[PDB]
RNA sequence: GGUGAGCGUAGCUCAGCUGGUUAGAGCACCGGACUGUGGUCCGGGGGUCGUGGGUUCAAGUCCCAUCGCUCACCCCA
RNA sequence: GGUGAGCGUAGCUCAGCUGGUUAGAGCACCGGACUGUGGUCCGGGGGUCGUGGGUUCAAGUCCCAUCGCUCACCCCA
C-alpha cells in the first residue's frame, strides 16, 4: 500500500538502461574536451541555493536542502578544495539527481537527472562557444538529428535594468490590456511578459513594437556575444539569434542558450546554460567568473524515443540450468557457482518438467540449456543444448567449463 | 566560506574512480547471477522507514525520509511493480546513496554510498547460500584477500524472545556489576550485552557461562541454517561461526551474516546481511520471503588501500595544443574541434612559451604536443611533437586528423 | 504548492447502454493433457470495479466528496 | 544528536622555547633569466596564525569560550 512519492519513478530495464547510455556518451564528450568528473552531496546548506525547493533542519538546527541545481554546487566544491591554484580554466562536470518542489507534467518531475558542465576562472568567449559545441556535441553523439540551438544574451547588470525599465515604461500604461499573469509580471518581472503564452499579450506587443534585449547591451556584452557568434560560424554551428533569453536570477549575465526539441511535450528544452559571475562572491569567496550548462537525461530519452533510435536487446545468460529432480538443484547451483562470473549462469529454484524449462530458457534467451535429471546426477554428468543449432552433447562435469568457454569464443 | 556540511565530502579523481571501479564489479558479479538493477528514489514518504534518520516534510504536508537503508526500498518497488507475477525469485541489486544521522568517525559517514542485493520470493535456504557466495566473491573479485565471513542466526521470534527472557532472567540478580550502557541495555536490548566493549561485562559474561543464541535456535531456524552451512561446506566458503550476531529490527529472521576486514577503523563490518520475513507486509503487501546483503563502498576502498591496491595511472589527453601568439589561440580551439571526440584534445588559452607549453603538456601526459605560432598560422599548418620519441613533424592542418590517427593505433 | 481539464475495472493492455438480478478478454505467473527436450490443448489463484457517502427494489454504470495517475498553465534555477 | 580525547600557521604537507619587538619552508599557480621546444636559476600574489574575548610593555605561543576537522564510545538498519 506504500508507493513512491508523486513526482519519483523507480527506474530499471530499458529506460536505466537508456539514462546509462546516455551519461556513458556524457562523459566520453567532455572529457575528451579535457573537463574533470565530479560528485557533490545530495544536500548542501540551505545558504548555496537561496541566492520551490526541498528544505529542512537536522537535529543540529542547520538548514539544509535538496540539490534543486548543479552549478552552484560546483562552484563550492571550486571554492572548498582551492581550485583557484590549478591551472586555468578548470573544467568540471557532473551527472546526478535534482530535487524541485512544483507539479509534475511531461519531462517535469520531483526527482530527476542532470548532466553538468562548468567552466571556471576565464572570461574568454572561446568557452562560452566551446560550451555550447559541448551541449550541441553531447546530444549528436546521442544520435539526435532535428535540434533547435537558441543563443543570446542577458546582458550585464546596467543593461537589464535599463531593459527593465524600458519594459515597464512602455507597458504600464497600457497594463489593463495585460492579462493577469502579465500584470503580476509587470510588478516585479516584466521580461517575463515577452515568454507570454497569452495570444492578447503576443498582439499587443506586436502593436507597441516592443524592442527586443537584443537592442539594449552596452559595448562590453555585446562585443563578447559577437566573439562568441564569430566562433560558432567559424565552426558551423547553426544557432537562432534570440531576441531575449530570459534568466531568473540575475548573477547571469552575457551569454545565454538553450537546445529544443521538437514532441516530448511543452517543456521542450532539453538543456541549457550561460554565463554568470557573482556567483562564487554569494558562497563568500572571490570573484570566479563561469559559463556552463545542464541537461535532462530523461527528456533526451524522451527526445531519443521520439527519433527512433531504441536500445540493442538485452544480452540473456550464457547457460541456464534445469533440474528435473528434489535433489538436482542443489546441484545445478553448485555447477553454476563453478562457471561464474567468467560466465552467466542461471538456473531453476525447483524440479522443472524438461519442455517446461527449455522455454523458460528461449524465454530468457539463453545461448546454452543445461539439463540435470538423475541419469546425469549418477553418471556426474550435465547435458548441454546449443539453443542456436539444437545440437546436444553429454559431458562429465568436471569437463564442463572448458567446453562453454571454448563453445562461447 | 560556504563548506559541505558534516559527514559529506565531495569525490573526484583517484577516489571516485575507485568507487567507479568498485561498483562495476558488483554490477558483474551480481549480474552473472541473474540480478536485475533496480534505482529507487533518493526520498521515501516515511512509513517505509520506521519499522537518527534525515526526515522532513514537503509542503503538501507529507513526512519524507532521506534513504537511510536499501533493502525497504527494494521491497517496496517489488511491491509497486508487481513483480509478483515474475518468475520467483526475483534478483535486484542496486548501487547508491544512502543517508543516516549518526556522528561521524573512520568509514562512516553521513552520506555514503552502498551496494544492495535482495533475493525475494523465497525460503530456499540455497538463495542464503548463494546471498554469502555473492558478497564473498563480489570483495574478492575486487582483488581482496584478508577477510572474515561470519554466518550466524537471529532464529524465529519465538526463539528470539526465549533468548531475550534467558538473557534478562541470568543477568538481573547481577545488575549492579554491569557497566551502565549494559544497564540500559538490560532494560530493553540484553542482546546488545553480548557485545559489549566493556571489559569487565565480558568477563561478567564468561564466568556466568551465558548460554549463545545458537543454543535457542528452535527446530525450523536449526534445519534451515544447517541447510546454508551445508551448502557452504560444499563450496568451501570458509566462514567463522558466530555465536550470535544480533540484528536491530525483528523483522529479521533466520540467516544472519557479515564481512569483515582488519585495519580501516573500528568499523570492520565491509557489508553484511540476512533473511528477513515480515518487512512486505509493514508495507502493506502479503508474505514475501527475503535475503539479501549491502556493503559500503567507501569501507571497501579503504581496505583495497590498506591492501595495496591502486589505480593504473590516469590517461592523458592524445593532444595538447601549445598557441605561441594571440591569434593562434582561437585556432587550436578550432583544431581541438575537428579532433574531438575521437580523439582527447585540449589547448592552452592563452599565448605560452613553447618551453613552458612543452611542460604543461608532459605534466599532463600528453601523447603528442602541437605546436601554433605565426608560421604555422601563415602556412596554414601545425608543429606535431610525439613526446614519447622527441620526434617532430610539420604538417598541414588537412592532414593533422589522418596523421594522429594513425600514429595512434 | 496554486488553477484547470481528462482518466481510475486483476500485476500490465482493455471491453461493459444513468442501471438489471451470479464481473468479463489478452498478456503474465502456476498446475495437469503427453513415458526426459523448442517458444499445441484444459483448469487454476487472483479485483474491497481507487475510497467514502448519497440515490434506488437494484450501482462498475447516476449524484457528491475524497485520494491517486496524466497533461496544460502559474513558475522555471 | 549525547559523552570523550587530540588537532586548527598560505589552496596542500609542516617548522616556530607560556611570550620578545618587521611570520617562516616545500609543493602549487604566475611572471622574468635565455633569440620558437623536455619535466636549471630569480622574484612575485597570497595568511584576518580557525573565531571572539581575557592576561601582558609585548601573544602563533599563555588562560577562557566558541566554531570546525579527526578518532573512539553510545547507537548501528
Ligand atoms: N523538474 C525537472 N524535471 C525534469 N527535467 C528537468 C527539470 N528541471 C530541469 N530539467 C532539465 O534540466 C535542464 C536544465 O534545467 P534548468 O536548471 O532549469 O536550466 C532542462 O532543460 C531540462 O532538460
Ligand atoms: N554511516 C555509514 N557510513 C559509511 N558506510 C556505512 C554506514 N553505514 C553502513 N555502512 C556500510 O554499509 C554496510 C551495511 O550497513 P547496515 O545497513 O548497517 O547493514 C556496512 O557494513 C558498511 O560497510
Ligand atoms: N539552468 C542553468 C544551468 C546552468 C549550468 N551552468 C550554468 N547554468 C542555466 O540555464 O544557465
Ligand atoms: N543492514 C542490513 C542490510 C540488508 C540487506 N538485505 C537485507 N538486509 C543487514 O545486515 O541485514
Redesign the pocket.
Known sequence: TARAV?GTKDLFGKELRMHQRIVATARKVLEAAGALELVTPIFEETQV?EK??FTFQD??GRSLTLR??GTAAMVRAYLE??M????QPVRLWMAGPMF???????GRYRQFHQVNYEALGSENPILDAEAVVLLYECLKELGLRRLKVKLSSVGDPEDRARYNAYLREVLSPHREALSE?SK??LEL?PM?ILD??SERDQALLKELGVRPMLDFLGEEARAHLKEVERHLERLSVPYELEPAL????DYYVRTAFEVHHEEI???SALGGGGRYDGLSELLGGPRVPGVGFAFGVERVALALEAEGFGLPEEKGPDLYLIP?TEEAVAEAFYLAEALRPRLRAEYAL?PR????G??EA??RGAAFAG?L????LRAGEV?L?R?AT?E?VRLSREEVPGYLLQALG
Not at 353 to 356: D, L, R, V
Not at 373 to 376: F, I, Q, R
Open positions: 508523486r541555493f520551490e525547493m537535529r543540529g534543486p541545481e578544495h582551492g583557484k591554484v590549478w591551472p524541485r518542489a512544483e507539479r509534475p507534467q511531461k499573469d503580476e509580471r518581472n517575463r507570454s503564452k530570459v534568466r531568473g536570477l511535450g511543452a517543456q528435473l525447483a518438467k524438461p519442455a517446461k527449455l522455454e528461449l524465454k539439463f535429471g538423475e541419469d546425469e547435458t543444448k539453443l539444437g546436444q
